């Protein structure tokens, strides 16, 4: 949800936070029997019962509404 309220450039902060969460799951799993991180992530992304998830839907929304009409490409620096 914090990703969903930010521009496209926050995908990096998103996957950083997801990695922190995965490490937390790995640590807590040493003692507790939790759901697999994939299952938890899919449940949180609405990607269990549906083909696409929230992250990709917001990626497309961001593309359409903010990326195509507002950004300038630089060929040399890419």
């Amino acid at each position: 949800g914090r990703f969903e309220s930010e521009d496209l450039t926050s995908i990096v902060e998103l996957d950083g936070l997801l990695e922190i969460n995965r490490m937390t799951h790995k640590l807590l799993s040493r003692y507790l029997t939790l759901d697999g991180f994939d299952a938890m992530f899919r449940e949180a992304n609405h990607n269990v019962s549906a083909p696409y998830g929230r992250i990709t839907l917001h990626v497309f929304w961001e593309l359409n509404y903010d990326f195509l009409p507002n950004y300038c490409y630089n060929g040399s620096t890419n």
């Binding site: 609405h46 269990v48 019962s49 549906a50 083909p51 839907l57």
Partner: protein
């Protein structure tokens, strides 16, 4: 001891029935015929895991 063991046995039988059903269902999934509705991505109801807390 025996009462709760018996309860476990009931639960195990129910889960075994469900697993048998799910396995026979999964063996006949068709990928080429599989069709996904782009229009219905969000109007679909999301799956929620159980949240029972004693």
């Amino acid at each position: 001891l025996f009462n709760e063991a018996h309860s476990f046995s009931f639960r195990v039988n129910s889960l075994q029935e469900r697993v048998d059903r799910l396995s026979v269902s999964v063996t006949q999934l068709d990928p080429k015929e599989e069709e996904l509705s782009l229009q219905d991505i969000t109007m679909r109801k999301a799956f929620r895991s159980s949240t029972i807390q004693d």
